[PDB]
Design a protein around this ligand. Structure first.
Ligand SMILES: CCCCCCCCCCCCC/C=C\[C@H](O)[C@H](N)CO
Ligand SMILES: CCCCCCCCCCCCC/C=C\[C@H](O)[C@H](N)CO
Ligand SMILES: [Cl-]
Ligand SMILES: [K+]
Ligand SMILES: [K+]
Ligand SMILES: [K+]
Ligand code: NA
Ligand code: NA
Lengths: 297, 97, 245, 48, 49, 245, 245, 297
């Protein structure tokens, strides 16, 4: 129990997020109301104070004489699912016959969607995102030809054994999920849940994953978020003998049931590396186009 | 509860049973370290001997509290007091008691 | 009545006679963590007045050629006062912040600073200039402590993103002909209920001149920018020995 | 980590060394998610 | 020695806060664990052999 | 009141003044087979007191170097008393068991035995050492009778499985500073309602030292371990001539 | 049920299987300071779990020739954990204490320690032996920190008063044939509502052998005495920079 | 307000002193009840466990067969006021004609009652004491003769100017209290309130009065409690010319309205210095008498 007054009148422990604003339904663009001339002192909607940090609250009606416009224009296409639930390329895996890369009929791809710019720029508009996803796998030869070949795709979560050969015992896939599909079949497609140990994936993590001295040798770990590390996608041709065909697997992702928090400025410099915002210091470009003078088009 | 191999050091086949127990004995002094181990249940080490550790291997993520029960098996005439500590993330291996 | 203000928390009071209102980041006040959002089971410690109070940490000089600076939270405070001690002795931490940036000049000086809070402010490098080297920023640059750090390329915020859009973040401007301070209240922002005060900076504070400082020769040329901040609703858990890194 | 708080004490006639057996398990708030294959595969070649 | 596991809980060993735990136990049912197809046999039908 | 105990069944009574409760395997007491689980149609015989009683079958000596032993059920008893006779004259048999393992020392001795019941205890061989030979354990090793058998590799229980996890089975410990016996009640465990007492051992009893026996020179060095057990709810069916194998 | 005990406060739990009840000094439990007894007007800080928890500070060896030791409160803790930090950053402090002194031997060892709490334990000097010199005890002797200090003349408690009457103070005995610990709960004792943790020690803890330690050659000769204590209801006020003296 | 459960069920701030014991009226000694023989197992009042820290609870009735005794013996003389409200010598001031000490017709005595052993030993039985007091001043020549001399006694609280001569301006005593009395009059006598800034005077203060390094030079301040420093008692002969008589002032104090807390062991070694417990290390004596053997009187 608490007898001293300060403990009784304390707000320590208040877990209610007091919100200053609230969402309202808005299925169409706002209408325009009739307005007339106003020749008045004291009232001044045109004048603002941007220093406050808010956007202007002046409307069409208070700046010019307006007619009535009933606006039926929908706001549905700018919801997050409308914007993001479109499949884009997020990965490409090569399985060549002769080569330096994945030459032995199998490949392990760490799941990271930051290798392709179109998709990466869209998701980075937000800091945190939570969503389910639909993955589609398009496979063919490097000329786009369809050949009679059987493949196996296996999802290897962190800690599960990664295959190290086309004949690895790991392909027994007794617990990991695997998809067996022919190149001749339509693209394989599956639904994936939101898997992070966190409440959301975060495209930006300003910190280190571990404690300790942060000596230059281990600075490659700055910004490394294990909560976004979902594991490995492994693929192989199904056989003990080498495949007769060179193959390519393209991976498409389509987000669904999306939630996002904390909008941020959008990327204005070319991407250089996966999951890291380095930009070429010798080629910093203006965000957009330029002109010769401020007084001519 | 299954046996935790805190003493996961001997590896020769004839000494494997020694992994199931660790010792205490009269110390000549003060605050001596007896043993240490990581509390991570799904990490290589002592916990691999437990059924929990093994079942843990079939799941990527886990959540919850753990418990370790220590049974003393010395003679009835032996006495003693031990301090068993759990150090949360960030704290390095304690240098002293 | 929008221009005058007094902020009192703990044993500290700030006054200003040329304010421009107060911004409450994302329209939400700081609060303690609920029993349903929480996951860690130990009873937290909430020191109250001894940690939720204003700390004045640093002063910078605004020069006609200044580029801008940034500070990281809670990094700026991990070695200061009772707050620092708690952040060091405990694995878990969470709190909101009241930030008050100060800068006064005269009715004959001019210039405008953009004061913004950017959550998860990951710093990038120039990649060896040519853009062929995957270099990384060193510790003193990602977590500069109370001294802050100067921006090398303010236009892209040292992270390949346009400062022109930084206003999509909680912010205020210190436009000398109008006000002499910026006040921003930030709630705890993270994808986890509590986190390490040492390994993770939840947000960065940016103070960047957008309209350069100017005045005629003969007017006081030393125009300081002082940063004062206060943790709000601080909670700590996972107690053990003190750790600095 | 396990430390001696005082000391292991015994009278004349009792062994100077004794052993402790540790037993571990999870509490009732413990749950696991995202079924995956175990890191070990207990076979070398084909099982006959 | 009795043969039972310890009945001590977090609440009786340290001072705890209230935590409302919504973590599901569904993925550890036997069907969740076993209803996943794994390789159990391989048959070779070669031409020469 | 947890330490003192008396077990009386048939014309036999066991006492102990240093017990550690009683374990009822899988939380279920033995019972007779119901009319719906049964399949064989002849009326069974349930001898009662003449077969459900304690039989003391063997004594082993615990030495500082002992590896551990096992016994198989109902094998240990197929040649003893009226129980044995019934097990021999009938094709079908079923029963539960009350097992009481005994071992007393002194307040100056030390050590701990793990006493466990493992259903369907299939013994493996070392496969010719190299692991290339598919050798099999001989009869005297799979069904050792009342003498029991000594474990060759206790760590893997002579079957390629960790003794560290044997506690997932009904068990007790005889830790000398605490108790001098273990009592386990086991219900009939099988995937069939009745079975052959000769061809099938439903479970094995394991007595393995985990903390080795120790004492100073001069203290009684002969520390026996005696096994006493009692069948419970025995039923027999499918009568014909007596058979031993 | 008087002999077994568990003390849990903060993230720490102490167990004992040979206790002799618990003494609550002057029959009064610790409590926070009321609004009518208080005088200082700033809102105090009450850190709770991070400071009210058990700290094991020191171990002494009991030898057949030991004289006895003392520790001063809150001096023993001013440099330890979050408690120490608060005691250093704040002018005002107050708290009660749960003291648990530990000492186990064997049923063949013997001896008895008097464990007492003496409020305002002012140390005196031998006055140059002849008693003609007005000498004073040095700082390391009046406030020995966590190490404690050994008594030079236990009979007069280094202060000209009889140890034979020390039992008029909250106390327990650790008589080896009976118990292995002493537990004393002390409320805040002072003539002021709050005070400086640095300049003033509210009480001293005395651990003095009255019946000397003895045992036959061959029995463990190293018999430690360990001191564990926990602040209760800690309150701090008058915040400024950290100070150690 | 407080929403998290732990804040709601918190005892932080409980200002109620929970007491395990309570005072009962006890104006006379306890009576004795009739008792008879008891030959019973299980019940055993004679056996104790002194380790617990409590005193024995065994009574006459349970150890021997007793008769009934109705006890009317009063407990009134052992109350604190009965024990302490008796005037004892606490100060002595010499005002000689020729001399080294106070030779100029005036003296300043810092108020400290620890200079005399009878009184000092009684008050030191407790740690804290709060009381009012009656002070009596007995003055005469060194032979005990009464001479026609006028004196002035002045109480000088800390911070008031201490006189430095028989003619000091401070004797104007416009605010300090002063007593003008003749040696021929009965002893002067006044009542004094409880004056400490603290709630009680404390005969023992285990600490230092100030912060800082505690270097050996300033160790004379260990145990110095300004809260017990009530000021100076100043006396002078009332004149601009020297007195014809040598004088002695004896100061007696009688406590009244007494409260005491925390009993402590009583002094068993001779006192050496005022307000400090130093004892002669070369002459540590047993508390009481000794004998040659434990088996003879
Ligand atoms: C049988 C085929 C199954 C394929 C399984 C695909 C699982 C993919 C999970 C979605 C992960 C979202 C992307 C997460 C993090 C980012 O890529 C980077 N790590 C950010 O640094
Ligand atoms: C006009 C004559 C007035 C005389 C005034 C006498 C005031 C005396 C106040 C009582 C003080 C009690 C004693 C207090 C403290 C002790 O003597 C020591 N300082 C303890 O160290
Ligand atoms: Cl783990
Ligand atoms: K509309
Ligand atoms: K639940
Ligand atoms: K009476
Ligand atoms: Na306006
Ligand atoms: Na009694």
């Amino acid at each position: 129990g608490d007898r001293v007054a300060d403990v009784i009148e304390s707000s320590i422990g208040d877990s209610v997020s007091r919100a200053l604003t609230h969402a309202l339904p808005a299925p169409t663009g706002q209408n325009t109301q009739v307005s007339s001339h106003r020749l008045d002192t004291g009232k001044v909607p045109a004048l603002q104070a941007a220093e406050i940090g808010a956007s202007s609250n002046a409307s069409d009606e208070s700046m010019i004489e307006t007619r009535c416009v009933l606006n039926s224009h929908s706001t549905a296409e700018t919801t997050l699912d409308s914007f993001f639930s479109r499949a884009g390329l997020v990965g490409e895996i090569d399985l060549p016959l002769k080569g330096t890369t994945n030459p032995n009929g199998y490949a392990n791809w760490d799941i990271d969607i930051t290798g392709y710019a179109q998709m990466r720029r869209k998701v980075e508009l937000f800091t945190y995102m939570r969503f389910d996803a639909e993955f589609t796998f398009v496979a063919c030869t490097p000329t786009g030809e369809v050949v009679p070949q059987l493949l196996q795709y296996m999802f290897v979560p962190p800690g599960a054994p990664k295959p190290d050969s086309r004949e690895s015992l790991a392909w027994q896939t007794a617990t990991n999920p695997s998809v067996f599909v022919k190149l001749s079949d339509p693209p394989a497609q599956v639904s994936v849940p939101f898997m992070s140990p966190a409440s959301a994936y975060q495209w930006f993590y300003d910190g280190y994953p571990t404690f300790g001295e942060h000596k230059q040798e281990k600075d490659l770990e700055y910004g490394a978020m294990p909560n976004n590390m979902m594991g490995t996608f492994s693929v192989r041709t199904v056989g003990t003998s080498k495949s007769k065909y060179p193959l390519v697997v393209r991976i498409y992702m389509r987000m669904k049931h999306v939630r996002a928090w904390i909008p941020r400025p959008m990327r204005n410099q070319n991407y250089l590396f996966k999951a890291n915002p380095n930009y070429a210091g010798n080629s910093i470009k203006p965000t957009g186009a330029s002109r010769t003078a401020i007084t001519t088009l | 509860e299954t046996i935790l191999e805190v003493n996961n050091v001997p590896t020769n086949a004839t000494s494997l049973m020694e992994r199931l127990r660790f010792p205490v004995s009269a110390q000549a002094g003060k605050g001596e370290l007896c043993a240490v181990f990581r509390a991570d249940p799904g990490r290589n080490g002592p916990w691999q001997s437990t059924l929990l550790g093994q079942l843990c291997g079939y799941y990527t993520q886990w959540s919850g509290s753990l418990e370790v029960t220590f049974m003393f098996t010395g003679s009835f005439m032996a006495t003693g007091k031990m301090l068993i500590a759990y150090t949360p993330p960030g704290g390095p291996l304690p240098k002293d008691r | 009545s929008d221009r005058v203000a007094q902020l009192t928390i703990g044993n500290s009071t700030i006054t200003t006679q040329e304010a421009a209102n107060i911004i409450v980041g994302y329209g939400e006040w700081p609060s303690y963590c609920s029993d349903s959002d929480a996951t860690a089971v130990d009873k937290p410690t909430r020191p109250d007045v001894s940690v939720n109070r204003f700390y004045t940490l640093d002063t910078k000089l605004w020069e006609k050629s200044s580029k801008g600076w940034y500070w990281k939270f809670p990094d700026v405070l991990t070695e200061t006062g009772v707050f620092g001690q708690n952040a060091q002795f405990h694995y878990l931490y969470r709190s909101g912040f009241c930030i008050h940036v100060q800068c006064n000049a005269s009715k004959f000086h001019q210039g405008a600073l953009l004061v913004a809070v950017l959550p998860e402010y990951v710093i990038g490098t120039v990649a060896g200039g040519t853009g062929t080297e995957d270099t990384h920023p060193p510790y003193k640059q990602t977590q500069p402590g109370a001294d802050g750090f100067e921006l090398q390329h303010p236009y892209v915020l040292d992270a390949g993103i346009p400062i022109s859009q930084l206003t999509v973040c909680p912010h205020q401007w210190i436009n000398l002909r109008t006000n002499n301070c910026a006040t921003i209240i930030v709630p705890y922002i993270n994808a986890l209920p509590f986190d390490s005060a040492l390994n993770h900076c939840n947000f960065g504070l940016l103070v960047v001149p957008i309209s350069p400082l100017d005045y005629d020769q003969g007017a006081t040329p030393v125009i300081p920018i002082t940063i004062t901040l206060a943790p709000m609703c601080s909670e700590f858990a996972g107690l053990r020995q003190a750790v600095t890194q | 980590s396990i430390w001696y708080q005082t000391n292991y004490v015994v009278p004349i006639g009792a062994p100077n060394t004794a052993y402790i057996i540790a037993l571990a398990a999870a509490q009732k708030n413990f749950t696991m998610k995202l079924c995956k294959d175990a890191s070990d595969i207990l076979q070398t070649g084909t099982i006959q």
